[PDB]
Design a binder for this molecule. Structure first.
Ligand SMILES: [Cl-]
Ligand SMILES: [Cl-]
Ligand SMILES: [Cl-]
Ligand SMILES: [Cl-]
Ligand SMILES: [Cl-]
Ligand SMILES: [Cl-]
Ligand SMILES: [Mg+2]
Ligand SMILES: [Mg+2]
Ligand SMILES: [Mg+2]
Ligand SMILES: [Mg+2]
Lengths: 224, 229, 224, 229
DNA sequence: CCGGCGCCGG
DNA sequence: CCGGCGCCGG
């Protein structure tokens, strides 16, 4: 009866045709998005205007990002589950344009290195039976003049949509043979030199797990 | 086939003798703690030193606050479910010294105006049929000199435990019939003059809902009718 | 292959018609003996001369007590599983006269208080469906002038038969209803006033478990 | 129906990486430890401080020796399976610092003549096909002024850990064909002049068997023919 | 053989 | 959610 008036809401999972997502109403962004990439889901007629994002009415208005929040902010609507990953079905690609699957992203990053990383991810489907992609924001602390560590990020728009300090991407590469291989990257939410090799943004999965509060490694060895 | 190898981050609920909490591994802090204050439960022989907190090993070490994180930080280990709310059962009281029921709190606040809000909450068990207390942190943005808004909060210890900018306490009060009276408070994580009446810190529940990402009103209203104070 | 030449021998259990026993070849006595007492096993024709003990040829001669070891020592051959507990079968009472079921016992104790304790044990079978009796020696330390603790006991005979410093008896009273009740006693191997109430020699089972190296309480709660 | 509620005291064997032991809960000490010394296993990078023993929690607390028992006792924690017999594998070597492989040993003995007997044992792995070492304590009676014999040994610590009066080491040596050569030693738990040749401490195996309650000869002879030294 | 403590840890 | 450490403990 300690829950007579329910519980103040907990982890909001959303199942879309092309990804699953854990929403953070506090930041008005996804904590993570999970895609399962295969070669056939990568081809097809699916298309959409680059700027055609719509708000997620399944998120309460108190905690829902809107297009107006992005207006004049200088940030792209960076999709986490990328639209080109889901050309196989117009509905499946449409679902990537919900704002709940986007985060404020510095435009030079969205167009260049972060895009490059997505291209790379799709290429690994020629070698791997399944490329699971888990994408999400990070908010990483910094030490200031006073010796103290602070998390500092801008919030944009009326609804204070959090602007991540970095993005992570975890590739869970499922071999046809059953070997699972992990490649995880972090890039700062900042203009990133298009010519730095993607490999140099690799980080140990554990540094990502530590910062994000997510765990993949115990979940992977559930059936490994 | 999309979750065949698990999901990275699920609802981190914890049911204790004295409260229910939802835990946030990114902040290493609860999102909210829920108690039902009964007057029966307010008196008893439960006691524990003020400085005797335990890390919560039910949280993976990567996201678990430890006592080393607080040491030398300048912050009190501020319990969200208050110790003195559960004196009837020592186990009930010990549960409040799990660090997952704690957040860095400015000591003058923890020991004064936040303490006074707790004592006032216990007082309402005398005058209402049920007192529910939902307590939690806030991280509220501020507008800076360039005109832009930013959330800025300190993190302490090797585990980067987040220092809240504010705290909220929502009282769900059961009047005689089926009337629920809501009463919500915000205090800044800062020295708060003890002499300011607690009613000066009331806020519309909606602002706590908006800022916290939590929802109280639709949950309560599926259970009669409401009188926001 | 770390056991190519076997193992230097380990815990010697013996199953007799009337008790089971764990033998200690180091002391040439039983570590414990276990009887299961019931009212019908207490009646019958079984009899034997009080002094008619025979040595246990199932024990190696190096570690086997003999009658000659007892000769002139001033100690009775105290039976642990008591002969009167097993009148129902001559073989079953005979088995109690193996020296492996005896220990050197001060005679005034064997005749009086220790005997009284055995009488008491048999009486509890009118109330309890099973009276399990576990009997054995203790060797308890003493502090001397130098502040140090020492175990000191005489050994008798050519074969150095250890003379216990005390005896324990644990009664495991099995109710018909399933309640198990424990009564455990310790008496010093010394002349004991026949008129002290048996209750005053009760001790917590744990003090017996600690000294002896036996455990009953975890074994009792195996099926309790 | 006679063991329907269990037996109070069974064989307390322990299999470790580096030895097999039989444990005695009354004495809180091993009855014997059995190793097979291979030369391969004698060299490696295994190391551990001389003072870094662990209590063996596989033994019930009521009968388990702890480091507090040895502290201030004046006795070395004397390992029976020697550390330097298992340098190939750190886990193998760490197993010898379980206190259930230890007995109170007079320091001058542990660090000198008993050490020399161990080094000599390792030396025999060069000259024999297999070296088996069985090591253990003794509690040997003494005749007193009243003409009667008594075993008297100190017990140390709150757990009353028994100080042996002597120690035995039995070497089972595999000669070229199938010949086993037996070689058994006794030293008193006391300062032993390091200069006395180790052969002066040989004894007939039978005396160790008689005193210890252990049997070696019939076990070996079910495996060819024997040459007692 | 279990259980615990505070602390560390994947 | 498990695992560990030394120490305590039934
Ligand atoms: Cl898809
Ligand atoms: Cl919502
Ligand atoms: Cl810090
Ligand atoms: Cl019988
Ligand atoms: Cl034997
Ligand atoms: Cl001592
Ligand atoms: Mg993009
Ligand atoms: Mg407080
Ligand atoms: Mg008798
Ligand atoms: Mg040594």
């Amino acid at each position: 009866e300690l829950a007579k008036y329910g519980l103040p809401g907990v982890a909001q999972l959303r199942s879309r045709e092309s990804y699953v997502l854990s929403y953070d109403p506090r930041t008005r962004g996804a904590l993570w998005v999970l895609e399962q990439l295969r070669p056939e889901r990568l081809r097809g007629d699916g298309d959409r205007s680059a700027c055609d994002f719509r708000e997620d009415d399944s998120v309460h208005a108190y905690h829902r990002a809107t297009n107006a929040d992005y207006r004049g902010s200088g940030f792209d609507r960076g999709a986490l589950a990328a639209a080109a990953n889901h050309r196989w079905s117009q509905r499946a690609m449409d679902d990537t344009f919900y704002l709940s699957n986007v985060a404020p992203q510095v435009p030079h990053l969205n167009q260049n290195a972060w895009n490059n990383l997505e291209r790379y991810s799709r290429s690994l489907t020629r070698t791997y039976q399944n490329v699971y992609v888990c994408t999400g924001p990070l908010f990483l602390p910094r030490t200031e003049a006073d010796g103290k560590s602070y998390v500092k990020y801008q919030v944009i728009g009326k609804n204070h949509v959090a602007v991540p300090t970095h993005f992570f991407k975890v590739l869970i590469l499922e071999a046809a043979g059953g070997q699972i291989e992990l490649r995880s990257y972090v890039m700062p939410n900042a203009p990133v030199d298009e010519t730095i090799p993607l490999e140099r943004f690799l980080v140990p999965i554990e540094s990502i797990e530590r910062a994000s509060g997510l765990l993949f490694v115990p979940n992977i060895l559930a059936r490994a």
